[PDB]
Design a protein around this ligand. Sequence first.
Ligand SMILES: O=C1C=C2C[C@@]3(O)COc4c(ccc(O)c4O)C3=C2C=C1O
Length: 334
Amino acid sequence: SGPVPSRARVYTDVNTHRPREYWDYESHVVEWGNQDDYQLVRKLGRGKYSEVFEAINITNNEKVVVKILKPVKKKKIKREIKILENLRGGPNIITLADIVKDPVSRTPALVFEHINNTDFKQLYQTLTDYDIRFYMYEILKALDYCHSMGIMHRDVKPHNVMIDHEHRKLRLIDWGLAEFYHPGQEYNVRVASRYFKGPELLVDYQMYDYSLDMWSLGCMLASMIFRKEPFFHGHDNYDQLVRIAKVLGTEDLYDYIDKYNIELDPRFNDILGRHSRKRWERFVHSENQHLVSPEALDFLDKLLRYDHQSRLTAREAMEHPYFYTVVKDQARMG
Ligand SMILES: O=C1C=C2C[C@@]3(O)COc4c(ccc(O)c4O)C3=C2C=C1O
């Protein structure tokens, strides 16, 4: 008949129950700020869809970051803008400060709050067990918030998580692949970085939901506590699922495929083969054991599940004993 349909377990109808103007980004009309407020200072990065610069707001001398977009259809730009505006003020969500027309490229440029982020090299060789729990908890706040607002990020990965370590400050950035969740909708599976793609994308199951972000987050946790980035390192999208199967096993993978009546290319089955489920303890060695605990492995195991419907939600994840010390610490009298 086709694959078995699927709905999100939580926040299923959040957009169903909001005004059309909340999620109908195509009709959103941008009001433009003034580009002459901002002077570019140095290029930070070059992407396929944008250039990113450190800049100065010359009217108050504050640093900002400017993302100058490549020419793209109005609809994709409006989607990102709408989502950033809907989510503005949410916990650990990057703040969109302004939208201007770049005077040279004549393309939209998005202006963000500046985060003095610690570079990866120093960070992931200095992070303690407590640091990892704390920052994971902060990422979960952002994901619960955006999921509760009817939005999937769909590009959760280390480089889209900015951390200012001395201020213990974290922002989830890069909302350019984000989309509104509508139950029953078939989404594009060409989202997320290869290494953080969930099984549902790798087998071309389009009716996915917020739980995609929880797989990606589980991949991030594994890479941090086992000190191997990325944890699942495939050479293409097919090989990515093979790397996952060599750890999670093929039994539970085929059970997943059976439950949703998903059809795989016969050659996919070949490369997938037959693999036993490994114990998480197999990846613990002397150089990472200080980051690993029974609580971390239990938590990890409940994120990295083939069946998207069986993964923890962000709110459930925050209730895990892994975070008891973090929660206690954040319970302040102020
Ligand atoms: O869509 C994006 C993309 C970026 C690219 C980029 O990662 C560059 O570097 C940044 C930054 C944001 C704050 C910041 O302090 C910083 O250094 C960025 C973004 C924010 C977004 O919403």
